[PDB]
Amino acid sequence: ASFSKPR
Amino acid sequence: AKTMEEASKRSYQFWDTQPVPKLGEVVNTHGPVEPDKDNIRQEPYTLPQGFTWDALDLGDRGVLKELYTLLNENYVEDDDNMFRFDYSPEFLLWALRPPGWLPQWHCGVRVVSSRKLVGFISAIPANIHIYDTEKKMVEINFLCVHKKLRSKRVAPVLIREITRRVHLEGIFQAVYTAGVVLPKPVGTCRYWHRSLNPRKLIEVKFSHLSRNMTMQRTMKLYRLPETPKTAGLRPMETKDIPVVHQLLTRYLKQFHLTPVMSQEEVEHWFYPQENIIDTFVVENANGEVTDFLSFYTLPSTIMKSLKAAYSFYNVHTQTPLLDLMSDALVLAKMKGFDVFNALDLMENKTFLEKLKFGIGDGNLQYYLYNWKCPSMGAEKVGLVLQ
Ligand SMILES: CCCCCCCCCCCCCC(=O)SCCNC(=O)CCNC(=O)[C@H](O)C(C)(C)COP(=O)(O)OP(=O)(O)OC[C@H]1O[C@@H](n2cnc3c(N)ncnc32)[C@H](O)[C@@H]1OP(=O)(O)O
Ligand SMILES: [Cl-]
Ligand SMILES: [Cl-]
């Protein structure tokens, strides 16, 4: 799994 | 390493020993790396002194509590270390007890003396369609080592032990995702985010006010209708299980990596559970269910709470996909989500920019264990993991 946020 | 340029330089002490293709390798075959084993190691792998294996019975509420505590304090974070997934007990039962689940595959590591839970990895069974082959595999999830045990080589032992436990059951392939680049991705996806409550997202630093744009301007850009527009949209019910199963199976045939779900598996993964999984079907003027959308719930602790929806499987045969996803956003907004997340897999690139999603900074790499096949573009990946 990966946790991403706006770039 | 999070990019294929960083992974170009490295060497892989553990993965070089495993039946996966080499990072440089370009693959034009389809099949196992090594043969099915007719004799399997009967003894668990040796752990460091003072640690021991334990299969976690998640029907025990205190054990389930130990697991989500381990995960909430030590599992995946955003790379800025601002937010960590906040896995609920009920979510974990959904993700970890699908049909065919096995207790030995909920594989824990405990301190011998105190019995404290300090490591975990899980396998769940899944039939997987990969190019022209259907194989029984497992999906590996929730590899977690306690922050104070990190970098002590416990992860490879967890991997070898769950591999052994899966081999004992006659299964020799696995699928798994990771944010890091390892030998060797079968496909690479990007996360995208759609603001629903922009005031909260900018306040909690999840997003930032874009260049020369006011707060008032930002809410206006992301404003959504109060009710969905698609005629006949309603929550999935028990009577919809067969047609949802039919719709999904036919729709997934166009992709190259997909699950093959039984009707019981469709019930488990899609039947709505508040604060876990939402599924809405489109029932038309003829009474026919022609489309459905689904997203699961995974909040994050602000290291309040960040309430996030994750796009799951969306199937269209008579409603335009664009319209279906607009209503998904409207529904998530109604249900109080702050952000709606989706990958660029399946046909999602056809709606991400149109619906004002913004690209994220992470990669989600997909991997097969002991299956050598050509890599594929994100739009041919038709498999979503939790
Ligand atoms: C037939 C059945 C087969 C079944 C098994 C199929 C394979 C299953 C594969 C796993 C599917 C997981 C699916 C998910 O759950 S993906 C989610 C992974 N979990 C997290 O991100 C939670 C937060 N992080 C942690 O808890 C730790 O950092 C973990 C436990 C991830 C690594 O622990 P630690 O930081 O203390 O490292 P180490 O010193 O002990 O060991 C490092 C070695 O392991 C390699 N590594 C690092 N991260 C990952 C990763 N995410 N997948 C595979 N390998 C990973 C690493 O490059 C190195 O190998 P090499 O560089 O030496 O070669
Ligand atoms: Cl269990
Ligand atoms: Cl094939």
**Contact in structure between B194 and B327 (CB atoms under 8 Å):** no
d(CA B120, CA B53): 9
Residue B101 buriedness (CB in 10 A; 0-12 / 13-18 / 19+): middle
Residues B361, A7: C-beta atoms closer than 8 Å = yes
d(CA B229, CA B328): 10
Residue B211 buriedness (CB in 10 A; 0-12 / 13-18 / 19+): exposed
Looking at the CA of B257, name the nearest ligand.
Answer: 3
Residues B85, A1: C-beta atoms closer than 8 Å = yes
Angstrom CA distances, B220 to B110, B217, B233, B236, B331, stand at: 51, 5, 26, 31, 18
| CATH topology assigned to domain B1-386 | Aminopeptidase (3.40.630)
Question: Residue B302 — φ and ψ, nearest 5°?
Answer: -80, 90
Residue B285 buriedness (CB in 10 A; 0-12 / 13-18 / 19+): exposed
Residues A4, B178: C-beta atoms closer than 8 Å = no
Residues 6+ apart with CB under 8 A from B158: B107, B109, B119, B120, B121, B143, B145
- Residue B198 CB neighbour total at 10 angstroms: 21
Pairing of strands B174-178, B358-369: antiparallel
**Contact in structure between B65 and B78 (CB atoms under 8 Å):** no
Looking at the CA of B30, name the nearest ligand.
Answer: 3
Mapped onto helix, strand or coil, the DSSP state of residue B342 is strand
Tell me the HSE value of B224 on the side-chain side, using a 13 A CA sphere.
28
Residues 291-310 of B with CB under 8 A from A: 300
Q: Which amino acid is at B92?
A: L
Query: Dmax of chain B from CA atoms?
Result: 66
**Contact in structure between B83 and B303 (CB atoms under 8 Å):** yes
Residue with tokens 């897999």: B345
Resolution (A): 1.9
d(CA B141, CA B188): 17
Compute, in angstroms, the gap from residue B193 CA to the centroid of ligand 1.
25
